Design a binder for these strands. Structure first.
Lengths: 177, 113, 138, 60, 86, 122, 53
RNA sequence: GUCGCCUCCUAAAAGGUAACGGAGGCGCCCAAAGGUCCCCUCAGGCGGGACGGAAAUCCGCCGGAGAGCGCAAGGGUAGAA
RNA sequence: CGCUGACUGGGGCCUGUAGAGCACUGAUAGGGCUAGGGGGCCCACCAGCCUACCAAACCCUGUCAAACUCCGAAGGGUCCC
RNA sequence: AAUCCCCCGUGCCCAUAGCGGCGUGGAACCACCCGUUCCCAUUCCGAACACGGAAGUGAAACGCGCCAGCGCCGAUGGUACUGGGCGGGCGACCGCCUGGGAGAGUAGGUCGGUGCGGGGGAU
């Protein structure tokens, strides 16, 4: 949303209210613009979890946003970001999240819980074609069970930029099973 | 391993053995179907198609003779250039009776080996 | 930064003796956690402990995860007196590099675990930083 | 032929070995005095390194 | 009349390896590159090494000397343009 | 091309070996390609602790030779089943094995582009 | 040298007379009264060479 | 306690420096690990069969050599020692 | 002896800490797949069966090293101009 | 005989050539091939090394092409570390001013590029 800059001035820039952030795209880049105030708001929403874009000179109103960056620093306040769009029908490198609900199985009865080393899902469905919020939770939880890649259950866009059997999300003893 | 330490069979380094010095790499490349040798001499040297089974057709005298000549001649072709004492090049296999053959060539070829 | 004699000649190859990592429960978004800023060969023991007392006060779901762990150690009085000092080991930990990802109180809506960790900081030693993660804490 | 005109300041008293040489080199006797030279990255360098040393002026 | 234990304490002594003559100086039929004595010198400079490329020593005479593996025995001649007709 | 995959011999051993002198001489007379290899280990599961002795006997025999043997030796063996192992190959008896030879076997011999022998050819 | 009746024993070898000898260290270890090889005494050159002493 | 000598680390990146600072080896040996000329392609893992169910022996696949080199380490390095 | 010297500019060639990194190695945590020990069940030469406790090794999420490093700068060196 | 397409000996650049998946070639080339008295030769057999020769074949090694899954290469903007200069905190240490500025991390790039000679293939 907006964000400007692109000359050659990171220090002061990298200072005050404007944080660096390259204009990255397949084939071309352009001095860092943006701002340490927009990043906020938007970013605050769900960086590489949905997507939008800003109007700098109406130039090229496109999506793709961030494919890297960091609040690095100790303090925990980012500085020096990466920005890449995608006006193509190739959209792959697509990492969008996936949520459950709380389906009661090991929890609200077994107190047991479940780790989700997954959460996210870098895949590649129908380029410029993804539900900013995709949910899938067949339920199940408790004892020494576990679910991961393999099973899963992918809708429409048949990608999987990923593999089978691997960090899905299981149920462990928040105390004992 | 480094390219030449995971494959097998060659000895190229037993070529570099003579590399050090002594003269032309009177290297004799074989392929049954025929024999073909050059003359890799030190300094990004080169060669002078000194002897080949095709150069002058491939005849019909098999191994024996072939060599016997290919060499000789070869040796003939070169000593016209201005060489003299050239180092041998077992290129490959053991100075088999072929090999040995060609070999003769050089020797008889008057190109000292 | 004086450190030890080697990873297998003086004292290197242990379990360091402690109480493992993970606790609490999952959670996809909710980013609930703790880190620091202080530098200190984190007092093993003190360490191990601390964190633990953490579980002692909570119990289940709240990433009682914790990303620390000592692995080297000091030494002192053993032998003659003060001069040519040989070495007698004791007390390993790990450098808390001037702040960083401590342990995580990670989960949907379960501050009943935030306060916890909280109780977890209180403890500890080198001050500590009370914080949230990508998004905050819900 | 950018001619450089530097002056003397903050006595190199006890300060880095070399640094001094860059002193006697560029041509640096008594204190707070003024000398000039051609750009010449050479002479240039030295002086610069000496930086804080004193003050450079583009003259002729 | 013996010696003890549980006192590791065992200082170490001296060496003296180097690249003597480093790369590209006035070459003199003398100790080329060093890091393995008994060494077996070579011809001119050396470029073979557990690194990749090679090293030239714009200095040429009889020969130099190796170090057993390190550096990378010489052989890729390189007398230097300073070896032509007077 | 059905003129490919369709087989054409390929090796085929037949041996023995005891924690030992000559017994292999009964081996020489039955064929002609003496096996001289040294087994070993260091325990007492037979009194074979000796970890560096000459007891391993193995009379290699592919093609040509093996033929005379596959022949004069294939009659006294009574089975034909199970003893059929994956890697197109198999081992029965006082010690004997023989390997298949589909068209995609050799390559696994090259020092270079050593195609880890695909599992659809073998 | 450090004379050590330990399989460590120093010896030489004549030159059929070529005259004198030449240096050598040894070890009964194996082949006792065993020790032969050629050289070249001030005597012309070469010459068989027993070692025993 | 300890003094000689071989290696690592310490040396901050040329070289090189204390510490009663860290850890570990040597006062052997090999007549054949000698000289060359000629051939070899490791450990291991997996799959198939004698005496064999760790752990061989052979046969068929996979392999910046992780085995290999009398001895401590470290460099080396199959092209090969 | 007389411009050669500390120093700077240029040009090669080197070292490879700090950092960082995990495929070499040794740690080490959350977990998945698995076989070793369990463990409860046909009574158990059964070596057939399920599964909540410990594990080895491979796989994902992670992390420490002076005597680890596929990676690699600050800089210092040395010959020439 | 002093131009391109191809195969063959073969060299430099030490994986932007390796792995592997499919494929194509045999007039020419090359191998596999056909046999084994004599040269030589296997600690066991002429499998490999090897001498003589057609038919047979492109299966295999092999050569050119397509495929990013494993690998290899790898910028820009960016953060650590720091040569030099100067300030804060008793404190482990923090910061500033000026030139140097990596790895990993997304883009993407790669399925070699290029020497000399020999056989042809282009009156």
């Amino acid at each position: 949303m907006e964000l400007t800059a692109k000359p050659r001035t990171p220090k002061q820039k990298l200072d005050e209210s404007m944080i660096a952030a390259v204009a990255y795209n397949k084939e071309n880049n352009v001095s860092f613009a943006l701002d340490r105030k927009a990043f906020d708001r938007a970013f605050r929403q769900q960086s590489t979890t949905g997507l939008f874009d800003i109007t700098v000179e109406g130039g090229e109103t496109f999506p793709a946003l961030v494919k890297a960056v960091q609040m690095d620093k100790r303090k925990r306040a980012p500085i020096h970001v990466d920005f890449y769009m995608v006006t193509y029908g190739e959209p792959v490198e697509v990492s969008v999240p996936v949520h459950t609900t709380g389906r009661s199985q090991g929890e609200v009865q077994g107190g047991l819980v479940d780790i989700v080393v997954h959460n996210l899902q870098i895949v590649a469905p129908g380029p410029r074609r993804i539900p900013q919020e995709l949910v899938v939770d067949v339920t199940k939880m408790n004892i020494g069970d576990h679910i991961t890649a393999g099973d899963i259950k992918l809708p429409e866009g048949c990608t999987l930029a990923a593999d089978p059997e691997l960090t899905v999300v299981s149920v462990l003893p928040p105390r004992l099973t | 391993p480094m390219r030449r330490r995971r494959e097998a069979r060659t000895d190229y380094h037993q070529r570099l053995r003579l590399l050090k010095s002594g003269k032309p790499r009177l290297v004799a490349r074989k392929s049954n179907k025929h024999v073909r040798a050059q003359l890799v001499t030190p300094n990004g040297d080169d060669t002078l198609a000194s002897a080949h089974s095709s150069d002058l057709a491939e005849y019909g005298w098999e191994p024996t003779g072939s060599a016997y000549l290919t060499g000789l001649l070869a040796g003939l072709r070169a000593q016209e250039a201005g060489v003299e004492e050239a180092v041998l090049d077992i290129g490959l296999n053991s100075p088999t009776p072929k090999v040995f053959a060609i070999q003769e060539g050089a020797i008889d070829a008057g190109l000292d080996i | 930064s004086i450190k030890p004699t080697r990873r297998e000649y003086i004292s290197g190859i242990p379990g360091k003796g402690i109480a493992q990592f993970k606790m609490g429960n999952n959670t996809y978004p909710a980013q609930v956690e703790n880190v620091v800023e202080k530098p200190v060969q984190i007092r093993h023991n003190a360490l191990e402990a601390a964190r633990n007392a953490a579980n002692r006060f909570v119990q289940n779901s709240g990433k009682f995860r914790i990303r620390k762990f000592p692995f080297h150690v000091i030494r002192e009085q053993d032998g003659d007196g003060m001069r040519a000092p040989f070495g007698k080991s004791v007390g390993t930990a790990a450098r808390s590099h001037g702040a960083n990802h401590d342990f995580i109180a990670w989960v949907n809506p379960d501050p009943a675990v935030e306060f916890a960790w909280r109780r977890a900081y209180m403890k500890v030693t080198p001050t500590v930083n009370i914080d949230s993660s990508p998004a905050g804490n819900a | 032929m950018p001619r450089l005109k530097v002056k003397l300041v903050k006595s190199p008293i006890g300060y880095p070995k070399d640094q001094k040489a860059a002193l006697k080199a560029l041509g640096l006797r008594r204190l707070q005095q003024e000398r000039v030279l051609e750009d010449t990255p050479a002479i240039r360098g030295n002086v610069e390194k000496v930086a804080h040393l004193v003050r450079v002026e583009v003259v002729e | 009349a013996h010696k003890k234990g549980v006192g590791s304490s065992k200082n170490g002594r001296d060496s003296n390896p180097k690249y003597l003559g480093v790369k590209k100086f006035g070459g003199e039929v003398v100790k080329a590159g060093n890091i393995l004595v008994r060494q077996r010198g070579t011809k001119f400079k050396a470029g073979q090494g557990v690194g990749m490329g090679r090293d030239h020593t714009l200095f040429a005479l009889s020969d130099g000397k190796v170090v057993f593996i390190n550096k990378g025995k010489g052989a890729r001649f390189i007398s230097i343009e300073a070896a032509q007709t007077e | 091309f059905h003129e490919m995959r369709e087989p054409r011999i390929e090796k085929v051993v037949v041996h023995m070996g005891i924690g030992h002198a000559n017994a292999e001489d009964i081996l020489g007379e039955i064929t002609g390609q003496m096996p001289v290899r040294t087994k070993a280990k260091r325990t007492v599961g037979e009194f074979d602790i000796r970890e560096g002795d000459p007891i391993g006997a193995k009379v290699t025999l592919r093609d040509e030779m093996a033929e005379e043997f596959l022949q004069t030796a294939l009659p006294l063996a009574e089975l034909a089943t199970s003893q059929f192992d994956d890697t197109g190959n198999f081992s029965f008896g006082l010690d004997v094995t023989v390997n298949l030879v589909r068209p995609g076997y050799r390559v696994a011999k090259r020092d270079k582009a050593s195609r880890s022998i695909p599992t659809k050819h073998r | 040298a450090k004379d050590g009746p330990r399989i460590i024993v120093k010896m030489e070898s004549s030159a059929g007379t070529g005259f004198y000898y030449t240096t050598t260290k040894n070890r009964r270890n194996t082949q006792a009264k065993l020790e032969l090889k050629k050289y070249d005494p001030v005597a012309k050159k070469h010459v068989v060479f027993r070692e025993k002493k």
